[PDB]
Each structure stands twice: as C-alpha cells, then as structure tokens.
Amino acid sequence: SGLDSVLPPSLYALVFTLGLPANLLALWAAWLQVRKGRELGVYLLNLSLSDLLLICALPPWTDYYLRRDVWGYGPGACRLFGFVFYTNLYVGAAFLSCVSADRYLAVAHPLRFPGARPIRSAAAVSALIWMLELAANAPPLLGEAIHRDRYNHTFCYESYPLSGRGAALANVGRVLAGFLLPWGVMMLCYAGLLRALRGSASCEQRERRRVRRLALGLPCVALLCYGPYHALLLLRSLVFLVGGCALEERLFPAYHASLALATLNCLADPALYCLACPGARGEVAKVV
C-alpha cells in the first residue's frame, strides 16, 4: 500500500464535496419530470438515488483508505457499507442501460412507444432491477468479510488473495453481468438510435451531430469510469483461475485507484443527464 493514503481519499473528498449537491439537484430535476407523465424520469430518479446512496456510504471508506487500510467501525458495519457501495456501483450501470434502451425505443419506434401507462412499467422494471442486484450482492453479504492479515492492515469485505475459486467465479460473473451486459445494451441502443435517424428529413446536420456526440460518448464516459475496475477484477479472477503474492502486490494501488475512478461516475451522471440536457437545466438551475 501507500498511495491509498492520498489518492482515493482526495477523489472521495471531491465526490462528497460536489456530487452530493449535484445528485440532489439531479434528483429534483428527475422528480420534476416524473410529474409530466415521463418515464425517463423514473430511471433518472433511481439513478440519482443510487448515486446518493453510494456517495453517503463513501466517507467510511474515505477513513478506511486514508488510515492505511484499517477498519475500526465494527465487523457488522463494514458488511452494510460494502453492501450499499457495491450495490449502488452496479445499479448505476443498470439504470444507465435502461435509460439508453428507453431512448432507443422511443426514437426508433416513435409511433409504438411508450403509450400504455409508461410510469407503471418503468417503475416495475426499476423494482425488478433493484431486486436482482440485491440478490446478486446478498452472497457477498453472507460473509466473514472482516479479514485480519499479518502485515498490519485488517481489511474488511476484501481479501488478498481470493478464496478457493469461489469468489473468483463470483467476480467473473459480477463483471460479465453487471458490466458489458448493461454497457453492451447501452452501446447497442445508442448505436441503433444514431442509425434510426439516418433518413429523417427534418433533422439538420447541426442537430444530428450533437445526437452523435451524445450517443457515441455517453457510453464512452460510462466505460471510462467503470472499465479499469472491472478489467482489473477480471484479470485477478482469471489469474487466480488460470502468480503468488507479487502480482497482487503489483496491481494493488491500481485496484484501489480504479475503484475511485469507478465511483467518479457519480459526478458524470448528474452532469451528463441533468446539465447537459436542456430540459432539466431549465428547472434545476437555481433552487433558491
């Protein structure tokens, strides 16, 4: 260790300093357009709620990392903190994918979507996603999560190395079903959105290009945030499932910097889905 005394501390500090008011503003904007029959607003609201949950769970981890990886809050509390953090981290990606699929359906099939009480179906899908992610992260909750090591760290909810192929398969599945399934759906939906309006007589070149930047570049932001973490996770899980203590000692600060860069997608979501959107930043621009 050694870099977790400074870097993830400062990223978490920036997140708790800016994203929390930003996520509150995005939540208010999303709720404002839920009132107007919209069914993008429910996904945006749930995304902002998940981001707020992760942001408020961040600073126990801030202390954790800035005190040279030590846990003193209690064996019971790290279960809850890791559960909230690692569940919001995947729920965010799921709801980005849902927003992408919703936009693709609305644009490519305008005369057939959404139509029939759009708030109810979207709320049902949101609840189903929450249930599925909660079930996915329940097996980690069943845990001996607090770990004492010889080298004066005493982690919780993490282990170096992994344990007996089990957490390794769990991590491989977590990667391939909480990322690259939602990210893959999001990328395909945005590509289909940008290919569906190839033929529209009304959209000019100026307003085709901004849709192009959004469709190819919002998934890029999501990947650039959530990607290094899951790539490193899959790398460790595959190496343990093909290295000794040298490999993990080499990619350890990479792993705990990729986690911070992954939680950095709690500033981008409120920004890219409230301020970048002209509609939201007409209502959520100055609460006072």
From Swiss-Prot:
Changing residue 107 to A: Decreased proton-induced G-protein coupled receptor activity. GO terms for biological process: adenylate cyclase-activating G protein-coupled receptor signaling pathway; cellular response to acidic pH. GO terms for cellular component: plasma membrane. The chain crosses the membrane at residues 1-33, 38-68, 74-109, 118-144, 161-199, 204-239, 248-276. The keyword Membrane applies. The record marks 147, 153, 256 as: Proton sensing. Keywords: Cell membrane, Disulfide bond, G-protein coupled receptor, Glycoprotein, Membrane, Receptor, Transducer, Transmembrane, Transmembrane helix. Changing residue 202 to A: Decreased proton-induced G-protein coupled receptor activity. It is found in: Cell membrane. The record marks 133 as: Required for activation. It is a multi-pass membrane protein. Activated by a network of residues, such as His-147, His-153 and His-256. His-147 is unique to Xenopus and contributes to the more acidic optimal pH range compared to mammals. These residues connect the extracellular-facing cavity to Glu-133, a conserved charged residue buried in the transmembrane core of the receptor. Residues 145-160 are annotated as: Extracellular loop 2 (ECL2). Residues 69-73, 145-160 are extracellular. Disulfide bonds join 78-156. Residues 34-37, 110-117, 200-203 are cytoplasmic. Glycans are attached at residue 152. One of its GO terms (molecular function) is G protein-coupled receptor activity. Belongs to the G-protein coupled receptor 1 family. A multitude of proton-sensing residues, which include extracellular histidine residues or triad of buried acidic residues, contribute to activation of the G-protein coupled receptor activity and pH sensitivity. Proton-sensing G-protein coupled receptor activated by extracellular pH, which is required to monitor pH changes and generate adaptive reactions. Activated by an optimal pH of 6.0-6.6, a more acidic pH compared to mammals. Ligand binding causes a conformation change that triggers signaling via guanine nucleotide-binding proteins (G proteins) and modulates the activity of downstream effectors, such as adenylate cyclase. Gpr4 is mainly coupled to G(s) G proteins and mediates activation of adenylate cyclase activity. This is G-protein coupled receptor 4. It comes from Xenopus tropicalis. The chain holds residues 13 to 308 of 353 of the full protein.
